[PDB]
Amino acid sequence: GSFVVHDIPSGSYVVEVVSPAYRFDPVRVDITSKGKMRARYVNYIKTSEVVRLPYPLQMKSSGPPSYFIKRESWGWTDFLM
Amino acid sequence: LESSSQKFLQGLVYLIGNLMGLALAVYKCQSMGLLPTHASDWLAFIEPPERMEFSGGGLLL
Amino acid sequence: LIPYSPDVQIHAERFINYNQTVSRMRGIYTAPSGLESTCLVVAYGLDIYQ
Amino acid sequence: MLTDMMKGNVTNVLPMILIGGWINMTFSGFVTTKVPFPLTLRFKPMLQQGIE
Amino acid sequence: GMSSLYVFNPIFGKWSQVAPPVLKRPILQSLLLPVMDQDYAKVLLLIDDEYKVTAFPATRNVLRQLHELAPSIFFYLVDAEQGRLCGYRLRKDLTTELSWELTIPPEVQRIVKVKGKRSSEHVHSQGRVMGDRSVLYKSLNPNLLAVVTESTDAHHERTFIGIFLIDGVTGRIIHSSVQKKAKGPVHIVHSENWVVYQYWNTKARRNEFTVLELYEGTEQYNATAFSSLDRPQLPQVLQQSYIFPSSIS
Amino acid sequence: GTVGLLLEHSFEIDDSANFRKRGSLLWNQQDGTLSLSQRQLSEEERGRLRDVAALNGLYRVRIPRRGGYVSSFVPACSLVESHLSDQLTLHVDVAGNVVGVSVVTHPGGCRGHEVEDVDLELFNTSVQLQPPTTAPGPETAAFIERLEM
Ligand SMILES: *[C@@H]1O[C@H](CO)[C@@H](O[C@@H]2O[C@H](CO)[C@@H](O[C@@H]3O[C@H](CO)[C@@H](O)[C@H](O)[C@@H]3O)[C@H](O)[C@H]2NC(C)=O)[C@H](O)[C@H]1NC(C)=O
Ligand SMILES: *[C@@H]1O[C@H](CO)[C@@H](O[C@@H]2O[C@H](CO)[C@@H](O[C@@H]3O[C@H](CO)[C@@H](O)[C@H](O)[C@@H]3O)[C@H](O)[C@H]2NC(C)=O)[C@H](O)[C@H]1NC(C)=O
Ligand SMILES: *[C@@H]1O[C@H](CO)[C@@H](O[C@@H]2O[C@H](CO)[C@@H](O[C@@H]3O[C@H](CO)[C@@H](O)[C@H](O)[C@@H]3O)[C@H](O)[C@H]2NC(C)=O)[C@H](O)[C@H]1NC(C)=O
C-alpha cells in the first residue's frame, strides 16, 4: 500500500482513500511554493491549525462502515411488561 | 314542577343553568381547536387552479 | 423547527448504494411508480444500477 | 348534591383505550380506511398517530 | 446540420409506417403540446431556422384546434455564443412574431445551463401553516425559466456567478441573485417552487449550498385562473447557506 | 455622466411592425436617478389606442441599448379598462450593461367596463432601477460563538 501522486500545482488539498470496503478519514494537506508540506485535520467550520502531525501520511482504517440499519425484536422477558 | 306561578319562573332559571353550561362547553370546544373556523382548515380543502397559456423552450439553438 | 446550523454531515446509514457503486455518475433518472410512495431510481454512467 | 355529578360515569373509557393502544402498537405504519366525513387538521395527531 | 425524425415502437421495436419529411435548415427546437387529437395521440410541432412551425400529425381537427388556440403558445430560445434570449409566439395559423427580447454581454457573463419546470408535476398543498394558525400562500409558476450565467474571467478573487429568474411568457425578471467569490462546476435543480444550486468558494476551500424559495403573502389572488399576463406582484425570495463536504457530480 | 435612452411604442391592428419616438429618458449611472419625459398623444392616437384595445392586441415597447435591441409586450386591454398606469423597470449588470426592461401594470384586470377621453390625456409612468443583489454566505461565526456560549 502506498499512494504516489505527481503533476500537482500549489494549493491545499484533501487526501481521501475511497473504498467500498474499510473506509478512511480524509486528511488536509497544505502545499507551499517553497516546498513545505503541512498536514492537518479536516476542519470546515474552523480555518485554523488544530493539530500538526508528521508528513508521511499513515492512515489507519477503523473498519467496515455501517451500510445497513439494525432492527431488533421483542424479548420474552421484555414482552411481559 | 307546576305548583304555583312563582316556581314556574324558577324553572326558567333552571334552564338558564343548562344554557350557561352549554356556553362554557362551546367556549372550551373552540379554545382546544374542535371547531375549525380558520383559514388553514379551508386551505386543506382548496383545489389547484387550472393553468392556461403554456410556454416552452430550451437551449438547443 | 430545528435550530439553524451550517454543518451537514454525510451519514452512512442514509446510503442507498450499500455495496454496488458507480465509478462515474453521469446522471440519475427518477421515475414515479404507481402506488403512492415508490420512486424507481436508475443511475447511468460507466455502469447501470437500478 | 355535588357527588351526584362527581361520581357519574366519567372514568369508564380507559379500558377501551388500552385495547386501542395495543391494536395500534401491533400495526405501526398502516392505513386502514378513509372516512367520507370531512375532518379538521387538528384531529390528525389523534387520528393517524404513527404516519409521518 | 442535418435533422431527422424517427417513429418507432418502445414495446416491440418495429417502426411504424408514418414519418414526415424535413427540408430547409436543421430543426432548432421542439415542443410537446398537451392537447390530444386524432385517435388518442398528442400533437408535436417543430421550429425551423426559417422561423416556421411544422406539425407532425397532419390532421384537419389537429390544425383546427391549433388555430383555435392561436395566441396561447410561446417559444423562448437561448444562445451561448450569441447571448441573446428571444421570445416568439404563434399568430393565427402559423407564423412567428417577436414579443420579448433579452440580451446579455458575452464578454462579461456566459450562459451555461437552463432548467425549467417538469410537465408531469402536480402539487397537493397550495399553502403552508404559519406560527399561530394563519395560512401562507405559495407562488407556483408553471411558466418560469431559470438561467445560470458565470464569469468568463477566472481569478482567485474576481469571480462572478449568478442566477436569473425570467418568465417565458413576458420578459420580466423576478429575482436576480449574484455571488462574489464562487467558481467552478455549478449544479442547479428546479422544483415545485424551490431552486437548489451549489457552488465552490475560492476564498475558503469549501462548497457552499444555497437554497432559494419563492413565497407569496397571506392573501390569495384569483386562485381559479393562472396567467402571466396578469399577476403584477413580486414574490418574496428567501436564501440560505449550508456546507457540503463533497463534489456533487 | 448622464445618458439618454430611446423609448418607442408599438400600435397596430394585429401585427407589430411600426414604431415611433415617444419620449426621452435620462439615466445617471454614477448617481442612480432615472428621469422620464415623453410627449402627449394626439386625439387620433387616442382613438387608435381605443380601437386596438377593444380588439385585444399587444403593446410592444422598443428600447435600443448601445448593439442590442430590447422589446417587451404588455396587454393594452387592461390599460384601457383601467386608468393609465405603467411601471418601467431597467435591468442592469454589475457594470454598465443593459439586460432589458419590463412594463408592469398595477390593476392587471380584465373586466372591461368603459374608458372616457378625460382619462386618456396624461401619461402616468414610474421608472425603477434593479441592480444585482449580493447573496449571503454561511454565518458560521455566530454558530461558533453560540456553541462556545
Ligand atoms: C458486499 O459484497 C460482498 C461480496 O463481494 C459480501 O460478501 C459476501 O456476502 C454474501 C452475502 O451477501 C455471503 O454469502 C453468504 O454465504 C454463506 C455461506 O458461506 C451463507 O450461509 C449466507 O446465507 C450467505 O449466502 C458471502 O459469504 C460473503 N463473502 C465474503 C467473502 O464475506 C459482503 O458481505 C457485502 N457487504 C455487506 C453485506 O456489507
Ligand atoms: C379569474 O379568472 C377567470 C378566468 O380568466 C375569470 O373568469 C372569466 O371572466 C371573463 C370576463 O368576465 C368571462 O368572459 C365572459 O365571456 C362572456 C361570453 O363568453 C361575456 O359575455 C362576458 O361579458 C365575459 O367577457 C369568462 O367567461 C370567465 N370564465 C369563467 C370560467 O367563469 C374571473 O373573472 C377572474 N376573477 C377575477 C376576480 O379576476
Ligand atoms: C399615477 O401614478 C401614481 C403613482 O404610480 C398613482 O398613485 C398611486 O395611486 C394608487 C391608487 O390610485 C395608490 O394605491 C393605494 O395603495 C394603498 C397601499 O399602498 C392602498 O391602501 C390604497 O387603497 C390604494 O390602493 C398608490 O399608493 C399610489 N402611489 C404609488 C403607486 O406610488 C396615481 O393614482 C396615478 N394616477 C392616475 C390618475 O392613475
Q: Cβ of A22: how many Cβ atoms within 10 Å?
A: 12
- This entry's atomic model was obtained through cryo-EM
Asked whether F110 lines ligand 2 (CB < 6 A), one says yes
Unique residue bearing C-alpha cell 332559571: B13
Bridge partners (DSSP) of residue E54 are E46
DSSP H stretches of helix in chain E:
60-69
What is the C-alpha to C-alpha distance for residues A25 and B46, in angstroms, rounded to an integer? 51
Residues 18-47 of chain F with CB under 8 A from chain E are none
Measure CA E29 to chain center: 13
Q: What are phi and psi of D42, to 5 degrees?
A: -80, -10
Measure CA B7 to chain center: 37
The burial class, CB within 10 Å (0-12 / 13-18 / 19+), for A32 is exposed
Give the residue from chain C lying closest to A70, CA to CA.
Answer: C13
Look at residue F48 and give its three-state secondary structure.
helix
**Angle (nearest 5°) at CA F18 between F15 and F24:** 130
- CB burial of E119-149 (b: ≥16 within 10 Å; e: otherwise) equals eeeeeeebbeeeeeeebbbbbbbbbbbbbbb
In this complex, is the C-beta atom of A65 within 8 Å of any C-beta atom belonging to chain C?
yes
Unique residue bearing C-alpha cell 467552478: E184
Q: What are phi and psi of F23, to 5 degrees?
A: 180, 180
C-alpha cell at C15: 446510503
What is the C-alpha to C-alpha distance for residues E175 and F134, in angstroms, rounded to an integer? 11
**Angle (nearest 5°) at CA E87 between F20 and F98:** 65
What is the C-alpha to C-alpha distance for residues E55 and E62, in angstroms, rounded to an integer? 9
Q: What are phi and psi of F88, to 5 degrees?
A: -105, 135
Q: What are phi and psi of E112, to 5 degrees?
A: -120, -65
Q: What is the CA radius of gyration of chain E?
A: 21
What is the C-alpha to C-alpha distance for residues C48 and C46, in angstroms, rounded to an integer? 7
What is the C-alpha to C-alpha distance for residues E85 and E149, in angstroms, rounded to an integer? 13
Bridge partners (DSSP) of residue E109 are E151
Mutation target to probe the F interface, by most F beta carbons within 10 A, among A44, A45, A48 is A45
Q: What is the CA radius of gyration of chain D?
A: 16
Q: Which atom of ligand 3 is nearest to the CA of F106?
A: 31
Look at residue E69 and give its three-state secondary structure.
helix
Q: How far away, in angstroms, is F85 Cα from ligand 3 center?
A: 9
Q: What are phi and psi of F79, to 5 degrees?
A: -60, -40
Residues F98 and F91 sit within 8 Å (Cβ to Cβ) = yes
- Position C13: which residue type? E
What is the C-alpha to C-alpha distance for residues E19 and E21, in angstroms, rounded to an integer? 7
C-alpha cell at E223: 386562485
Compute, in degrees rounded to 10, the torsion defined by CA atoms F43, F49, F53, F58.
180
Residues 47-76 of chain F with CB under 8 A from chain E are 58, 60, 65, 68-75
The burial class, CB within 10 Å (0-12 / 13-18 / 19+), for F18 is exposed
What is the C-alpha to C-alpha distance for residues F105 and E233, in angstroms, rounded to an integer? 10
Contacts of C7 in chain F (CB under 8 A): 143
Closest Cα partner for A18 from A66, A57, A59, A69? A59
What is the C-alpha to C-alpha distance for residues A11 and A31, in angstroms, rounded to an integer? 5
Contacts 24+ apart (CB under 8 A), F22-30: F25/F127, F26/F2, F27/F2, F27/F3, F27/F90, F28/F1, F28/F2, F29/F1, F29/F3, F29/F96, F30/F1
What is the C-alpha to C-alpha distance for residues E169 and E156, in angstroms, rounded to an integer? 38
Unique residue bearing C-alpha cell 423597470: F89
Ligand nearest to the CA of C15: 1
What is the C-alpha to C-alpha distance for residues E239 and F135, in angstroms, rounded to an integer? 7
Q: What are phi and psi of E209, to 5 degrees?
A: -115, 120
What is the C-alpha to C-alpha distance for residues A58 and E153, in angstroms, rounded to an integer? 40
**Angle (nearest 5°) at CA E75 between E73 and E78:** 165
Unique residue bearing C-alpha cell 413576458: E170
- Position A9: which residue type? P
- Do the Cβ atoms of A68 and C21 come within 8 Å? no
Bridge partners (DSSP) of residue C30 are C41
What is the C-alpha to C-alpha distance for residues F19 and F9, in angstroms, rounded to an integer? 6
Give the residue from chain C lying closest to F147, CA to CA.
Answer: C5
What is the C-alpha to C-alpha distance for residues E183 and E201, in angstroms, rounded to an integer? 6
Bridge partners (DSSP) of residue E195 are E190, E212
> Measuring from each residue's beta carbon to the nearest atom of ligand 1, which residues come in under 6 Å?
A 67; C 19
Residues in chain D: 52
CA distance F94 to chain C (A): 29
Q: How far away, in angstroms, is E222 Cα from ligand 2 center?
A: 11
Contacts of F140 in chain A (CB under 8 A): 45
C-alpha cell at F144: 461558533
Residues E96 and E88 sit within 8 Å (Cβ to Cβ) = yes
In this complex, is the C-beta atom of B60 within 8 Å of any C-beta atom belonging to chain E?
yes
Contacts of B56 in chain E (CB under 8 A): 31-32, 73-76, 168
Q: What are phi and psi of C10, to 5 degrees?
A: -90, 105
Residues E104 and E81 sit within 8 Å (Cβ to Cβ) = no
Unique residue bearing C-alpha cell 453521469: C26
What is the C-alpha to C-alpha distance for residues F104 and F99, in angstroms, rounded to an integer? 17
Q: Please give the sequence-ordered ranges of beta strands (E in DSSP) within F11-120, or none if there are none.
A: 20-28, 34-38, 59-65, 68-74, 86-92, 98-104
What is the C-alpha to C-alpha distance for residues E46 and D14, in angstroms, rounded to an integer? 69
Distances from the Cα of F80 to the Cα of F75, F110, F114, angstroms: 9, 10, 8
Measure CA C43 to chain center: 9
C-alpha cell at E183: 467558481
Give the residue from chain C lying closest to A46, CA to CA.
Answer: C7
**Subunits in contact with chain C (3 or more CB pairs closer than 8 Å):** A, E, F
